[PDB]
Amino acid sequence: SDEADEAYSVTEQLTMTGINRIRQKINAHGIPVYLCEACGNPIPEARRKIFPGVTLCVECQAYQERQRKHYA
Amino acid sequence: GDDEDSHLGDFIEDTTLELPLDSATTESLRAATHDVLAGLTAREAKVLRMR
Amino acid sequence: VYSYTEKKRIRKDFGKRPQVLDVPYLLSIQLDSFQKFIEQDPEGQYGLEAAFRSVFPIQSYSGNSELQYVSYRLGEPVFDVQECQIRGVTYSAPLRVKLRLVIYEREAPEGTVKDIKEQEVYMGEIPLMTDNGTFVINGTERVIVSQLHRSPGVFFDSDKGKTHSSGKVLYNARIIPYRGSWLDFEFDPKDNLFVRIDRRRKLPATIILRALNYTTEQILDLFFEKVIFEIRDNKLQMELVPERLRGETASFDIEANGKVYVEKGRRITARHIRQLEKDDVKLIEVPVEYIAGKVVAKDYIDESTGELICAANMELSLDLLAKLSQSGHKRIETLFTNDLDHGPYISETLRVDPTNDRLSALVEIYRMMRPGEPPTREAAESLFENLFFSEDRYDLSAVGRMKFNRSLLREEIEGSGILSKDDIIDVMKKLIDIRNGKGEVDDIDHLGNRRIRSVGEMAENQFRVGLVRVERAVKERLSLGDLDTLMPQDMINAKPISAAVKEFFGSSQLSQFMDQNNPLSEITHKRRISALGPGGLTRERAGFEVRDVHPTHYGRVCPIETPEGPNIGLINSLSVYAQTNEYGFLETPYRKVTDGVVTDEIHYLSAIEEGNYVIAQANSNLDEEGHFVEDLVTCRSKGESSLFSRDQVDYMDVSTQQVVSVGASLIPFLEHDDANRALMGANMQRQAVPTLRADKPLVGTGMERAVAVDSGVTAVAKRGGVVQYVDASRIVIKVNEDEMYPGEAGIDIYNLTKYTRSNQNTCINQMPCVSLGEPVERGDVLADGPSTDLGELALGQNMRVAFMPWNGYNFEDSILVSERVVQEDRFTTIHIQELACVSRDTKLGPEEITADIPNVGEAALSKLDESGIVYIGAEVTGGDILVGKVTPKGETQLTPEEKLLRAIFGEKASDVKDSSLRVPNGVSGTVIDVQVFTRDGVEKDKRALEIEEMQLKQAKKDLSEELQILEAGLFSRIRAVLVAGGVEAEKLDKLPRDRWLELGLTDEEKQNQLEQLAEQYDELKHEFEKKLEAKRRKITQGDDLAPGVLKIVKVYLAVKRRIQPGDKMAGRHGNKGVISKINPIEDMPYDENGTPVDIVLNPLGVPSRMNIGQILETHLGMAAKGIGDKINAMLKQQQEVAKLREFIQRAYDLGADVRQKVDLSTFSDEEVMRLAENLRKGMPIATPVFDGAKEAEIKELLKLGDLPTSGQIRLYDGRTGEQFERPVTVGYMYMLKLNHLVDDKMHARSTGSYSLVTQQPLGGKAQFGGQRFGEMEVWALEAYGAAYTLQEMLTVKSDDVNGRTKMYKNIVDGNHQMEPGMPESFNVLLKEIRSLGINIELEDE
Amino acid sequence: VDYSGRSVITVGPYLRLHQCGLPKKMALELFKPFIYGKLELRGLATTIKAAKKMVEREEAVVWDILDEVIREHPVLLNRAPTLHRLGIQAFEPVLIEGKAIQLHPLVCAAYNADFDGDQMAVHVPLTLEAQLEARALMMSTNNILSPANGEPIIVPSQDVVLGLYYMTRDCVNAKGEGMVLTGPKEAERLYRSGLASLHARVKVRITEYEKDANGELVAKTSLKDTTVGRAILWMIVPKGLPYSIVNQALGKKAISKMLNTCYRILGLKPTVIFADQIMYTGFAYAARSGASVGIDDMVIPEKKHEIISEAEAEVAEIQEQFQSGLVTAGERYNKVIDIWAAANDRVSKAMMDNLQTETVINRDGQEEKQVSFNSIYMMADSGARGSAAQIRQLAGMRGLMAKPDGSIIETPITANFREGLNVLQYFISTHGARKGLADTALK
Ligand SMILES: [Mg+2]
Ligand SMILES: [Zn+2]
């Protein structure tokens, strides 16, 4: 087959695996947590209602995301 | 480097060889002259061979 | 408001935007760069003056022997361009320099000079640039592709991930100069910070700080912020800076005023910091444990003893707080460390610092640069100062300083040359801050780190290397320097620099053959960026990083034109409006934006200056005054793109085309194609061979005219005037009265270039298009080149396609071309092959070029003349002779019975061996032109004398036609003398022109004027006597051939290849194809009206490869031919000018907003008939690329004709005569003709020549040798049980040099046996193993 | 290797899958030695030199001599990357005008050769074991089963599948509706004469031969409620198969299991002859379908605008909740890409549901909906070329292009190829596209 057909298959592979990773991240299933998995603060309503079942307050989330921004 | 990957010795053709048409002609003519000397006598064929 | 030339056929132009930046002269890169290179440039900047001011003046070993620079010159060539393609010289230009050898007196530093011998010395021949940026090095037109390499400056790289297996990324920072020692910073996974000078050993990175006069106090106050603790009468108070506490553990009660605003254990969220800010806490009383891990900056010692309490950068434990308590300190300095943001790095690296202070650090640097050298005070000082602080031994170029100040967020873009304390410390701060979270890393591909060279700067560097290798010799010959006996040319050698510069221009990974097989190919080859070459990264070292596209390509390098396959992305093709900047980085236009207006001032942006702005998007409808139509518009700010408010944009794209190249901006309806497909489309449009009658893009993209004109092929008018005499060779423009210089007006003349070879073996023709007695405006085309037509780039031909399967003849991508396309000879492409027949000089004697040949009667010698060269015109075919050539071959060495045979018939065995230049087996042509070069040691034969006489007649004719014009200009100036002061009007046209010199005139300044102009006349006379003398002498001389050759005879066959199953073809959108059965006319489909659809492509290729652009192009084409046939009916049924005007006007307005309204009420009645006759084949249509014609416009433009709006007609099969169910699509698609011709590719070899080291097949002629029966094929045959075929595949057919001849004897004698033997390759292997001391033998049993 | 050649290839469906074309000139230059021998044997030229001059003049009798020595003399066609052991196969030659080594269409999938200019190299077997191996080890009709699995590698590829799929389908009210026929034969006499359209449900009397009688074939006739397409095709099926092999709508998977059943039940000879016959009749009825593609075929859902409106509304809501400090930047990024992927799937499913069932037509009564005859749809459904994803890109929105690193960019292409693309969307597409080429060209 042609040389662009194979490149289309690889692009499908690449974007599909990326998107399905990032959908695997977001939870969308409730496990009501009511305060952090680290700090203990109450998780406000709006945050727990957007992302159901989210273990961490906002600050703890930003902080872990920033320690992980340097990739561990 | 202009090709798959060559060295200039890989292109220097040959000139000692004989074109295999020549080999076939020489053999075919050996056979034909053999027959033509079959068309002579002992004195005839032997003298023309040895000549 | 059009010209009289532009009205030949006025391309219907969709495209809604107004163009505000007309297309730049597409070859700006090559021309402007080589212009900066070669010119006396009264300033030290770039050019040759740069190299000469760099390497000169040469001072000897202080001995008052100096050789300095004055100025240089570029003598005009000896052979001009076309002469230099005929003969084979390098179109050079001899150089000259005014070197000035000065010698000072001994007993004199600068005492009185004793000699200044000033003499001009030759060196090298820099090959000048043609008008088209294409040098001529050895007869062939070569082009030097611009390079793209890392700009000297600073770079902050990651090398993320894989190392150390923890995932933790490192953040290294390199300071690359133009010339000098590097400097690198890097983190270890243990997170201490290390340095390294040029790629040598690591070091505790604080050592270089200390080496720069830094002790620990000021280090810690540079790389850290302070937090003071206070002991105010009870237990360890602390300063409270409020924002110090975001994202941190609260290991204590944060009370204030005896009130609790934050409590222990928790985390200090933004709520807490907000409330502390509102509640005004400044000095919190925390326990000792929290100081227990802090770090102390300043030094502390017992003030009563002077004994060292705590060194700088030690961790305060409770005991040390106590110890300094009793010393009387209430201030305490502590580093504001933190795991998130203000991380401990320099402190812990001081932990790693083995050394203690400055001198030790300099010692360690001296011991890391070079081992074994014992350290020393002054040795250390010298070495460290001479790494980064020596104007002589280290210099960032000014480009270096500019990047180094723009990558630090500095102020001045230009400045010093060497580093400093502040440059190093800013590098380190930027590095630590990269690792702290704020800031990010510059990936490699970012065009802020790819400075673009070109011909100019690369040739300048090669001349630089030449100058250094010659100044070695200059200083050496000055070693022995006699003061006044060696003039300033025996110190130098000319051939060195010529060797270097020729090696560059003729042997480079850049200086490569022009892809001159289609005007788009040249002008997409000279616009080219390459990342390979000497000084760039090649494939192996790097690497996947640079293949990628990066969002700083938007208008600086084409994303949808790059050579697919082995090296993608390393051959980025430069954008349409891109340019090289002052420093070098690619830059592009942008329209400036005021408060809320879109100004029309275009303003250039490089790569590093863009992200700090916020650029709009060209696809933004703006409201007739320069205000946007909304308050929020799509933009792109820093890589990302998004909606912005109206009062925030700063820059709008110049035009919707600027994201692309001249390659992919010619694909109409590019906007609907998967980017891979536009890639393959442009990369198959660069290869279309110029057909016989190059027609036009029936559906174009606006840029096609600019590509045809700006490339060199079209014959563009230099000055507007009337046309006096057209002809198949020359065009004679009579310049007007206003475009005409004051003295010696004359008339412009263009000698076109008739049939002639290009590098790819095609026909670079030029045909006039402006007929006799016809105006032409300045800047207009006179003569179309190959594949241009009316000055509109026409690569292939338009023709009728119908998408439908049609019996598997178009199975995968195959194509089914009705014979109405090949009868017309419309893809019939002309290929002009060159065959040479040299005549060499062997030890036995000189080869003959006689017509007397053995073993060939008059039969093959009917086409030969009296001298062995063929006539100009004989239609040679496969296997005939073009040049009869015989080599003396002594020692016939008769054999057995062959000798008997010669006795039988007495036929004298000849002493001569036939070796005549016979046509390659297969071509079939017309010998259009025979040239005979001769070593000037041989008596030129009879035919070469015919050729000399003929060329000399031609040159005499030409130079005499030139003299006529010149003397007419001088007679004009004479009249301009008489016209003022006593002209006698009609007493000057009657008498002969030659007797105007003796015209009466009073002896004023005007009589002396007549005398002076007579002097000019006689000067012209003698000038052209001697110039025709020089022309006759260039022709008459011998040539200067290669060593040992008598005479070469070139013979230019001119084949005409038609079309035949195998010839690749392709649209523009990337639908390849291999025309597969050249069907009759009857068989083809035919719409209800009768016309058979010429091509028949395949429907299964539009959905699977999402290039729906070809269906939209087919529909726009069908509508176009609808308009065409309507005009054809209105013209054949001949109506009038009136109906034609109303109808063409209906076609040119057509609905939606456009920028093309023409108003034919200004076309005279007789121009509209010419306009119709140029439209009667079909109304062209423009469609700017990302701004094309949306579907509904096409549907209405169909309804203006009479086609069905669906686009799909109902077709009747041609064989059975019964309607195809489900109507097909038919239309006029423009199809190229790629030159992967079949008869170039076909090949077959039964018994050819053979190699010399291993008796394998090797042929040459078209690799006249077997296909490589490689290894994977051997795996294949072993997979089957077949082993006999393998054994003969590499014992009988290939190597065993008795096996093959016995196989041939058997084949002729009808006995398909084989007698293998053993391969000669393995026998070579036995010998090569055995030459080594390895006794390999074969047991025999 | 002496005795070889190579050239650009082409299609030529008029062949049987055990024989390839071979140009006259390439034939005469491969088989020079055998030709010389044949000439001096038949006495048409005295000695080998004269035979050389004769074939170098291309006289009249050399062509007849070559047509004799090319009668049963198999050659070996090969391609450049010979991945697996089918990269080399024998064929008998068929002498051709021109310069293209014409290749049988079913053989492509084995060679993995498309006809867009990929060159094939012909070797010629010399010895007599070599010819016997080309005939009984490497002939094309003795490699139908891939060595990597017993299933056939003679699966019809693209035009033939569209041919069969358009031949054996059914609309609801065409000509000759519900009439009765007495065999496949008068179904053919119907269709080729213009009384009943190619696919219109009919009753026929087919006669399927089951063979439970061990190697014996028990006849059995019936009245299948089938179409005119199916009964016209059933003539090409051999005796062995049962009639339910074709009574369905013949995609590509089903058509390959047709051949697989025929091979398992009857063997190799009838399955070769049946591969040839399916290919021929598929090509003919596809060329008769007129199945063209066109720009009116790609029916955007009118509901796409609402889906994208709501998608951008939810993204703006996440935006507001990001400025309010209620979700970190990572979580807003993932919420955005989530709601866009949801919108992508919704638009895809809505377009496919407007594209497949769109044919609502009327049988002798009110109306009915049925699987569409939409050219782009059949080319995506039967299995000729493409599938739901590529159609999704021509009608629905086109996904989210993802830059090469992996971090899929969050500015989704809200447009598609039928509509245009503005410059941002295209310049984003370039990232993923050039990445795709740069990998499958290093591959
Ligand atoms: Mg291919
Ligand atoms: Zn928390």
Numbering used by the authors:
A (entry chain M): 2 to 73
B (entry chain L): 512 to 562
C (entry chain I): 2 to 1342
D (entry chain J): 347 to 789
Lines from the paper:
Although only half the length of DksA, TraR regulates Eco transcription by binding to the RNAP secondary channel and mimicking the combined effects of ppGpp and DksA. To help understand TraR regulation and principles of the regulation of transcription initiation in general, we used single particle cryo-electron microscopy (cryo-EM) to examine structures of Eσ70 alone, Eσ70 bound to TraR (TraR-Eσ70), and Eσ70 bound to a promoter inhibited by TraR [rpsT P2; Gopalkrishnan et al., 2017].
All three structures are essentially identical except for the disposition of Si3 [also called β’i6; Lane and Darst, 2010a], a 188-residue lineage-specific insertion (LSI) in the trigger-loop (TL) of Eco RNAP. In TraR-Eσ70(I) and TraR-Eσ70(II), Si3 is in two distinct positions with respect to the RNAP, while in TraR-Eσ70(III) Si3 is disordered. Si3 in the TraR-Eσ70(II) structure [Si3(II)] is rotated 121° such that SBHMa interacts with the β’jaw and SBHMb interacts with TraRG, a disposition of Si3 that, to our knowledge, has not been observed previously. Deletion of Si3 had little to no effect on TraR-mediated inhibition of rrnB P1 and rpsT P2 but transcription by ΔSi3-RNAP was activated only ~50% compared with WT-RNAP on three different TraR-activated promoters (pthrABC, Figure 3E; pargI, Figure 3—figure supplement 1B; phisG, Figure 3—figure supplement 1C). Three TraRG residues (TraR-E46, R49, and K50) are central to the Si3-TraRG interface. However, these same variants exhibited at least ~2 fold reduced activation at the thrABC promoter even at saturating TraR concentrations, indicating a role for the TraR-Si3 interaction in the mechanism of activation. The combination of the TraR-Si3 interface and the ΔSi3-RNAP mutants was epistatic; the same ~2 fold reduction in activation was observed as with the Si3-TraR interface mutants or the ΔSi3-RNAP mutant individually. These results indicate that the Si3(SBHMb)-TraRG interaction enabled by the Si3(II) conformation accounts for part of the TraR-mediated effect on activation.
